[PDB]
Amino acid sequence: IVGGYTCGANTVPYQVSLNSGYHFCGGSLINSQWVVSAAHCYKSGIQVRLGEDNINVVEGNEQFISASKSIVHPSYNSNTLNNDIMLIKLKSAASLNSRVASISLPTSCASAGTQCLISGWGNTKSSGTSYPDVLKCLKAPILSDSSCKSAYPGQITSNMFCAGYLEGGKDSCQGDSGGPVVCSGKLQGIVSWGSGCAQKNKPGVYTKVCNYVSWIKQTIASN
Ligand SMILES: N=C(N)c1ccc(O)c(CN2CC[C@H](NS(=O)(=O)c3cc4ncccc4s3)C2=O)c1
Numbered sequence: 001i002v003g004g005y006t007c008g009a010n011t012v013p014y015q016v017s018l019n020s021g022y023h024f025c026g027g028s029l030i031n032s033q034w035v036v037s038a039a040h041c042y043k044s045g046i047q048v049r050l051g052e053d054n055i056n057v058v059e060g061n062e063q064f065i066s067a068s069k070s071i072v073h074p075s076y077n078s079n080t081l082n083n084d085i086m087l088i089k090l091k092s093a094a095s096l097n098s099r100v101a102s103i104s105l106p107t108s109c110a111s112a113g114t115q116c117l118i119s120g121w122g123n124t125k126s127s128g129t130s131y132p133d134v135l136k137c138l139k140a141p142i143l144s145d146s147s148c149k150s151a152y153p154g155q156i157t158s159n160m161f162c163a164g165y166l167e168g169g170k171d172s173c174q175g176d177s178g179g180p181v182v183c184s185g186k187l188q189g190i191v192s193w194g195s196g197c198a199q200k201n202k203p204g205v206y207t208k209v210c211n212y213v214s215w216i217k218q219t220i221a222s223n
């Protein structure tokens, strides 16, 4: 996260860290046994880390659970990043409490102008690389579709939306991918991509979760 602030230990209880010997992507806990992340984050040998703040120190409240299976959307296209969504089933159910809780799926899509909270352990610099120890947060509004398509001509599908600041300086970045975009208590987006980080006229692009609620429910129901 570039231009954000320190969230505060366990203030984003649904935030998850995908680990394979190091942190590589974020995710959101949607129920005691399922995590939602980005398809481009897929890799074998994933360990889901819950209740984390400082990802480099065991401070208590952490729960490390191996992924039993990862389900990348069947129509995911790595070239365009369309349908950048993946479901992860935990080997065992997580222990829900105040520091570890699930986030609700949306019943309808969010409107432009809606303020959301984006979080993650990604790069905090728009120039070089600087990874934080603790979880970073950023409040950002959903942009209009025309503004989004104007910024990224020919690269925005109906399954994506822009969020952030056209003035640059505040954005999500590498390492934040797969993470949550929560608006009004509902998971509306997944950190997917952008051109560089926090650059002028190049906001972040996110997977439009409201377009996948039926797929998520049907997939979870049969697995
Ligand atoms: N600004 C952000 N919110 C953000 C978030 C996560 C990232 O990892 C990056 C860094 N990222 C991710 C890739 C992007 N590279 S690129 O501009 O060549 C593009 C490649 C590509 N492939 C398919 C569709 C569209 C494109 S744009 C970049 O800087 C940026």
Ligand SMILES: [Ca+2]
Pocket (backbone or CB within 6 Å): 052, 053, 054, 055, 056, 057, 058, 059, 060, 062
């Ligand atoms: Ca820790």
